């Protein structure tokens, strides 16, 4: 019962908690799955984590009851997303997740991913580790090893369990800390949706063009274009990610991330247009987060689904 997308994707994260505070003092309410705009055709339930270190190192998922959904209602709403052709992934990691897997844990971690997948109807898993967890303990080897077990388990049932990853973009260099997740899952992952945000003054130097920072709003089109062109060709010191497997992750507003919000969507449409014109169209867009897009800013104004209104029709048309 493992729903996959047929073409472009708009990936959105869904908070398993209520009323998060924002980088500019807004508020992100919890919402049900049935409240999510259908143009979010990949919905990432956040987060699979270790809730209590006394329960051991294996991450798990526990639905937050304050969202107002029973277990059965949550399961049913996933089934309903699947009937619409939409996928629901489990996102592993997030802040304060205590994911510190050790060599030897990979079989039990795979078992728990399979168990939650059977119980809830998840269509796959997104690796969304916090900065410090990327190289913690044996995460770089145990997490890919466990996911290969899961992938092949479902492949043997004729099903494609989706595997995606949300690296912070500076770590995608040829010698970067994220490389093992990508190399170890080559041929296993379906796409990568890096975070092109929260890295302040990081960016990329483009010979003949100059220094293009992730927080430079005047060069946003050039940033999106050149960081993507580098990834999809394995150039400018970046690890290759094929263009049909690259999804461009950006904040849904200035409350969702400290930096990286795209002030003018036209900069993204034009960058994607240049990539398409050279024959390397990207697979779609990702955002942190659905709940922020449905949230409020510090003066109580609704974000009013502005992000999915800006990028949904663009990706799906």
Dihedral of the alpha carbons of 162, 61, 100, 201, in degrees to the nearest 10:
70
CATH number corresponding to 9-316 = 3.20.20.80
**Residues across the chain:** 317
Question: For residue 64, what are its two tokens?
Answer: 């937050």
Residue 292: closest CA among 281, 305, 276: 305
User: CB–CB of 304/35 below 8 Å?
Assistant: no
- Consecutive H or E run containing 15: strand 9-15
Experimental method: X-ray
User: Is 102 among the catalytic positions?
Assistant: no
Question: For residue 220, what are its two tokens?
Answer: 């946003």
Residue 233: closest CA among 306, 174, 308: 174
Per DSSP bridges, beta strands 87-94 and 162-165 are unpaired
Question: For residue 309, what are its two tokens?
Answer: 């209104």
Residue 108: closest CA among 146, 138, 77, 66: 146
Q: Is 46 exposed, middle or buried (0-12, 13-18, 19+ CB in 10 A)?
A: buried
Please give the Cα distance from 59 to 235 (Å, whole number). 35
This PDB structure is determined at a resolution in Å of: 1.8
Question: For residue 224, what are its two tokens?
Answer: 């999106």
- Sequence-separated (6 or more) residues with CB below 8 Å from residue 70: none
Residue 124: closest CA among 92, 99, 158, 100: 92
What is the distance in angstroms between the CA of the first residue and the CA of the last residue of the chain? 26
Residue 146: closest CA among 101, 93, 98: 101
Please give the Cα distance from 267 to 190 (Å, whole number). 26
Question: For residue 202, what are its two tokens?
Answer: 């990081």
DSSP string of 182-230, one letter each residue: HHHTTTT-SEE--B-SS-TT-EEEETTTEEEETT-GGGHHHHHHHHHHH
- Sequence-separated (6 or more) residues with CB below 8 Å from residue 238: 172, 173, 174, 227, 230, 231
3-state secondary structure of 285: strand
User: CB–CB of 166/249 below 8 Å?
Assistant: yes
Q: Of 100, 130, 273, 305, which one is the catalytic site residue?
A: 130
């Amino acid at each position: 019962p493992m729903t996959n997308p047929d073409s472009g994707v708009v990936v959105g994260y869904w908070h398993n908690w209520c009323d998060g505070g924002g980088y500019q003092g807004g508020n992100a309410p919890c919402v049900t799955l049935d409240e999510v705009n259908p143009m979010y055709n990949i919905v990432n339930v956040s987060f699979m984590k270790v809730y209590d270190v006394a329960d051991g190192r294996i991450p798990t998922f526990k639905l937050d009851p304050t969202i107002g959904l029973s277990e059965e209602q949550f399961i049913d709403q996933i089934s309903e997303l699947n009937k619409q052709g939409r996928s629901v992934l489990l996102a592993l990691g997030g802040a304060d997740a205590h994911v510190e897997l050790e060599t030897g844990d990979e079989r039990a971690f795979a078992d728990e991913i399979i168990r939650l997948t059977e119980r809830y109807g998840f269509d796959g898993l997104d690796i969304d580790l916090e900065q410090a967890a990327v190289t913690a303990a044996n995460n770089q080897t145990v997490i890919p090893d466990a996911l290969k077990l899961v992938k092949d388990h479902y492949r043997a049932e004729g099903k494609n369990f989706l595997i995606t990853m949300a690296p912070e973009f500076p770590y995608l260099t040829t010698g970067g800390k994220y490389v093992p997740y990508i190399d170890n899952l080559e041929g296993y992952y379906d796409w990568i949706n890096p975070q092109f945000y929260n890295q302040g003054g990081d960016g990329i130097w483009v010979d003949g063009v100059g220094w293009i920072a992730q927080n430079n709003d005047a060069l946003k089109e050039e940033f999106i274009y050149y960081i993507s062109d580098s990834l999809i060709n394995g150039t400018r010191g970046f690890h290759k990610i094929p263009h049909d497997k690259l999804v461009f992750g950006i904040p849904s507003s200035i409350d969702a991330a400290a930096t990286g919000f795209v002030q003018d969507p036209q900069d993204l449409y034009d960058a994607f247009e240049t990539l398409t014109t050279q024959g390397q169209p990207l697979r779609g867009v990702m955002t942190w987060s659905i709940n922020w897009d449905m949230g409020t800013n510090k003066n109580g104004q609704q974000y009013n689904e502005q992000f999915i209104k800006d990028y949904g029709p663009f990706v799906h048309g």
